[PDB]
Design a protein around this ligand. Sequence first.
Ligand code: QDX
Length: 818
Amino acid sequence: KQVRWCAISDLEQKKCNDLVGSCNVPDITLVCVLRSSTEDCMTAIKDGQADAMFLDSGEVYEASKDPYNLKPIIAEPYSSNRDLQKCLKERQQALAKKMIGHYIPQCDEKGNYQPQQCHGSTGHCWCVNAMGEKISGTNTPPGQTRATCERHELPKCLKERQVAFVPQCDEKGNYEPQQFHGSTGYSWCVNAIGEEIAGTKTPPGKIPATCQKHDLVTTCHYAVAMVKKSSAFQFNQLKGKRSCHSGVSKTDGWKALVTVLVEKKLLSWDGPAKESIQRAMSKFFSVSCIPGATQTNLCKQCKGEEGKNCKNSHDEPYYGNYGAFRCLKEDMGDVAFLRSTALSDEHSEVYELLCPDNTRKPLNKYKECNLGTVPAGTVVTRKISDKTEDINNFLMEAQKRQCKLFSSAHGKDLMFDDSTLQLALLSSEVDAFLYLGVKLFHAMKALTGDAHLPSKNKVRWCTINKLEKMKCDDWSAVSGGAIACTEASCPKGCVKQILKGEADAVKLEVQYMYEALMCGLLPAVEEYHNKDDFGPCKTPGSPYTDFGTLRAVALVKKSNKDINWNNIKGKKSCHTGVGDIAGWVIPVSLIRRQNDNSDIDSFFGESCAPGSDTKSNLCKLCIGDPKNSAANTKCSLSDKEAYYGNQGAFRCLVEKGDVAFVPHTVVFENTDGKNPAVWAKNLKSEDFELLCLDGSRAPVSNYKSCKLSGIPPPAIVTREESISDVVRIVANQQSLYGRKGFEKDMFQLFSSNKGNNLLFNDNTQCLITFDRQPKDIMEDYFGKPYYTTVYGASRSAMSSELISACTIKHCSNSLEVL
Ligand SMILES: NC1=N[C@@]23[C@@H](N1)[C@H](COC(=O)NCCCCCCNC(=O)c1ccc(C(=O)O)c(-c4c5ccc(=O)cc-5oc5cc(O)ccc45)c1)N=C(N)N2CCC3(O)O
C-alpha cells in the first residue's frame, strides 16, 4: 500500500516529490524519506525508516553486512546470447505499456523476430537479426524504398560445423566452453564466440584445463580516467596529482582504481589489516575531492557548503560521475575517475582518456582504455525482504505508465542511473554474492579486508541441519584441530559457502553435482557403497571392481510378456517420485531422447508418479493412504502416498502397473524371503524381469548389463587449491574414525547417535579418493552414458542463478557476430 524511497540529496528529494505528484500508481503511494548521504539512507532502510534505494554495484558487498544488511532485489536486465524467445517477451513487454504510438516488435508464428521491423506510429522500418539488433544503415523513413531484409539467424557454431575440426555446440547453437578435436586428441577452452583462450590447450593423456562458461553480453559500462588534453602526465605519474572521484564507495570512482594501482605496483600499501586504503590514497594523491572519504586532503577539493562538503550526496556539487566531470572542468583536479556514461562527443575536443598502459587515447576508445567493466547498480531493500513485493509492483506500474523514472530536469543520475532503460525483478535467491558473481565477490571481499586466510591443516565441513551440526561438532571435538564446522540450510548453500571461501568441502548427491561441477569445484572423495568388498577400504590402491553404485532399471513382471522398451508408450508405469534419479530422471531423459515429440504427460497411459499434476495422467491409479478418508493425499511427494518411494513404486507395479522405473535393489528388498507382510508376502524375485535398451529382457540379477543407466556415487567436493589438502585429512580422519579405524570406539564416521545419514550416508563403507582421469570433469564424474543421457554432454542443459554467478560476462558492442 505504501513504498518509502530514501533520497540522499535535495535534488533527489525534488525528483521524488515530482514523481509522487505526477506518477499515479493504483493502490500504492510513494513516500520520499530525506537523508544527507548514501550511508544514512542505507541505515534508514536498516531501521525500517525507508524501504528501498538504488546503490552502485561496488556498494553492494558492504551493503550485505553489518551495520546495514541489505540485499539487491531489482536490477536492470542485460541482453545476452542466452535469451531464448526474446521477441515474444519484448512484444509482451511493449504491449503492457499504457501508451499509444510506441514500437511494438513484430514476431512470426514460431516467435522469432521478423527480419523487417517497423514503427507503426512513424512509418520507419529497418532490418534486424535473430536477436532483434538493427542491421546498421537499414533504417528507412516512410515514402522511401525499404531495405530488403535477409534472414540472419544461423549461429557461428553451427556454421563452422558445416564447411567441415568439428566444433561442439549446444541445443541453441552456442559454443560449448570445452572443445575437443577428434582428429588430434586435444582439449581447449574457447570464448563465447569461439576464440581459443590462451594457456588452455592440452596434449592427450594430460588432464584437460577446466573451462569456464561464457556469456556474450552487450551495452557494457566501464570505469575510466578522464584528463584534459592540455596536461601531459601519464598513468604511472598519478602520484602527487589532484584527483576527482565520483565517490569513495563506487567502483567507477574508487575500487577499480585501487585494483589497477595495486596491480601496477604504484600504490604503496601493505594490507587491509595493516593499513586502511584511505590512508594509502591520502599519501598517494596531493589534494582531491572524493565524496565520502575520511581523510582531510581527500576532501579539500570539494565544493560542498559547510555541512554538505565531501558527502556521498548531490548536495556536494562534485559528487557522482557528472560531479567528477565538473570537478575536472573547473580545474580542481588533474584527472577524474568516473563511468563511461558521463562521456560525450561534446567533450572530445577538450578531454581525453588516461589508459593504464601509460598512454592517452580519445574518449571513443573507452573500450580499450579503462580501469574495468562496471556492473549496473541495483535497487536494494532489507534482507528480510518485507517490502520487495510492494516496491516491485510500484516500479513495474511506474514503468508501464511511462513515469519519469530515469530522467529529471533537476539533475542527472538522480534516484537511478539515467542510463537505465528497464528495471526487472531479481530472484529471491540473489544476494550480494549471486549479484556480483564469484570472482567479483571475492575481489570485493579481499578489498574490504574480509578475505579468509586459507589454512592447509584444517578442513571446514559444511552442514545442512542441526543434526549434522551436532555430528560435526562431535567430529571437531574428536579431530584435534583438523575439522571445523560451518552451518547452512541446504547443499546448494554449502556450495555457495565453498565458493565464497566460508567453507572447504561438502558431500553432494548427484542431483547437486552438475552446478557444483559448473562452478569449478572438483570431487575430492567419493562414497564407496560395496558392502561385500572392503578391499579398496583396507588399503589404498586396491583396484575396486564395483563402487556400490545403484543402477536404474525398468522392472516388469514375468506374467506380462508384451512390455519391451520399444513399446512403452501408452503403458502404465510406476515411478518413485518426481525428482528421483532412477525414478524420474533417467527414464524421462531417455524417453525425451528417443521420442522427439518430448511430452511425457501424454507418453504413458495412467502412470503413477508422486509429485505431478493431480489432474494429469501422471497421477492416476495412485491409491493415496488406504485408511485416511478425511484427507486427499493423492500424488503426494511424501510417505502419505502408498506408491511413493522405492517400495511404493514396487507396490504400484505389483498391484496395477506394468513397468516400474526403480533402482536394481528393491526387487531383492521386497521379494524372496526378505519382504514385508502385506502385499509382498509370497512374492519372489524369479517372477520379475528387467527391460534392456535393445528391446529385450533379462533376469533381475543382470542389472550390471540390462540397465537403463548408472548413477554416479555421492561426491565430497571442494575447491581446486584445497584438493591435495582435503583428501589427506580425510584419510587421516578415516584410519582413526572409519569402520576399521584405530579409534572407532570414540567416533564412527558413518554412524551417529545424533541421527541417521548425517554428513555421509550411514551405509557408506569408506571414502575413496578421486582418480582424476585426463578427460572432461563432467565426463569424469558423471560417466559418458549419464552425461549424454541427462545433460546431453552439454554445459547449457541447465540454468540457475548460481550458474550465472559462475559465468564470465564477455562484453561486446553487439551480438551481430552471430
Ligand atoms: N576419475 C574417475 N572416473 C570414474 C571413476 N574414477 C570412478 C568410478 O570407478 C568405479 O567405480 N569402477 C567402475 C569402473 C572401473 C573400471 C572398469 C572398466 N569400466 C570403465 O572403464 C568405464 C568407466 C566409465 C564408463 C562411463 O559410464 O562413462 C564406462 C562405460 C562407457 C564408455 C564409452 C561408451 O561408449 C560406453 C560406455 O558404456 C557403459 C555402459 C555401461 O552400461 C556401463 C558403463 C559404460 C566404462 N568414479 C567416478 N565418479 N568416475 C568418473 C568417471 C569414471 O567412470 O571414469
